[PDB]
Amino acid sequence: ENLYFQGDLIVSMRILGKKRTKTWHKGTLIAIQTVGPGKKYKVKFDNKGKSLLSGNHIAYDYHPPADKLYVGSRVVAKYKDGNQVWLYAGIVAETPNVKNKLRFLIFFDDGYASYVTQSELYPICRPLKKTWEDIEDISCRDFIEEYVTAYPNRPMVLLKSGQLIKTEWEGTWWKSRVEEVDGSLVRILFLDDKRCEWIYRGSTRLEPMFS
Ligand SMILES: c1cnc(Oc2ccc(-c3cc[nH]n3)cc2)nc1
Ligand SMILES: c1cnc(Oc2ccc(-c3cc[nH]n3)cc2)nc1
Questions:
Q1: Do 48 and 124 fall into the same domain?
Q2: Its family?
Q3: CA–CA separation, 94 vs 100, rounded Å?
Q4: How far apart are CA 94 and CA 69, in angstroms?
Q5: Does ligand 1 have an atom closer than 6 angstroms to the CB of 56?
Q6: Contact 88, 79 (CB under 8 A)
Q7: Centre of ligand 1 from the C-alpha of residue 127, in Å
Q8: Is the N-terminal amide bond of 37 cis, ω within 30° of 0?
Q9: Ligand 2, closest atom to CA 91?
């Protein structure tokens, strides 16, 4: 059947939709379709290209209030790519507290982690029951499932600037050094390449967590 209303969604609403590039973009909800128990959402992007999307692949174009966000909430967030910024899907790992200077910790679908503000987040419209089950990468999906279900039990390595450790990259161990700590994240310098990466302190990419 063709609907005009479905829960709190209304045909003609402005919304965000997931493109095949896996980045999210502004569009208009132009149709809502049912096939038995299933729903699909037709989005016209602001370039006139159109997609028929599942409800876990559309997001509201507004910033969610803090009492609506939990550990495990499915969101779209501002993602830093060199000198460019995109909107990319993730999971809420931490809500604002004194130890994280009142920020949200996001685990992105590709395994990147970063702290963001409330003005950098958007809520996905119809998340799955198990919110991690639409993460495509098996290693990221399994890690997120274990993290969200074990919370608040969170094993982490206590690290200090200057400490020498081994860090995983492309399947092998690399000589590295702790450059900085920010809450649950550590900035690692890869010593041979002389470039840095922010990594979650409970990641198995840090040799002390692997062991
Ligand atoms: C495939 C999986 N999930 C959905 O939507 C659901 C969303 C939430 C729940 C639920 C039940 C108890 N708590 N949350 C169930 C279903 N649709 C397709
Ligand atoms: C926050 C941090 N990490 C993830 O996912 C991953 C975790 C571990 C690996 C990995 C690769 C080789 N060894 N461990 C990859 C991805 N997701 C949220």
A1: no
A2: Belongs to the class V-like SAM-binding methyltransferase superfamily. Histone-lysine methyltransferase family. Suvar3-9 subfamily.
A3: 8
A4: 10
A5: no
A6: yes
A7: 7
A8: no
A9: 18
3-state secondary structure of 83: coil
132 Cα–ligand 1 center, Å: 12
**Are 88 and 109 part of one and the same domain?**
yes
Tokens 């969200």 sit on residue:
148
Last residue of a domain, one of 40, 59, 78: 59
Q: What angle do CA 129, 18, 113 make, to 5 degrees?
A: 70
Residue 55 alpha carbon, nearest atom of ligand 1: 17
Number of structural domains found in the chain: 3
Q: 113: Cβ below 6 Å to ligand 2?
A: yes
Is residue 68 located within the same domain as residue 128? yes
Technique that determined the structure: X-ray
In the DSSP assignment, the letter for residue 143 is H
Which value in Å is the resolution of this experimental model?
Answer: 1.6
CA gap 185, 172 in Å, rounded: 21
Q: CB–CB of 99/88 below 8 Å?
A: no
178's tokens: 């702790």
Residues 180 and 192 in one domain: yes
CA dist list (Å): 53 to 64, 76, 123, 177 = 22, 15, 16, 44
Tell how many helices (H) and how many strands (E) occur in the chain.
2, 17
209 C-alpha to center of ligand 2: Å? 11
Q: Supply the DSSP symbol for 211.
A: -
Query: Could you tell me the CA-to-CA distances from 176 to 184, 198, 200, 203, 208 in Å, in that order?
Result: 18, 12, 15, 15, 13
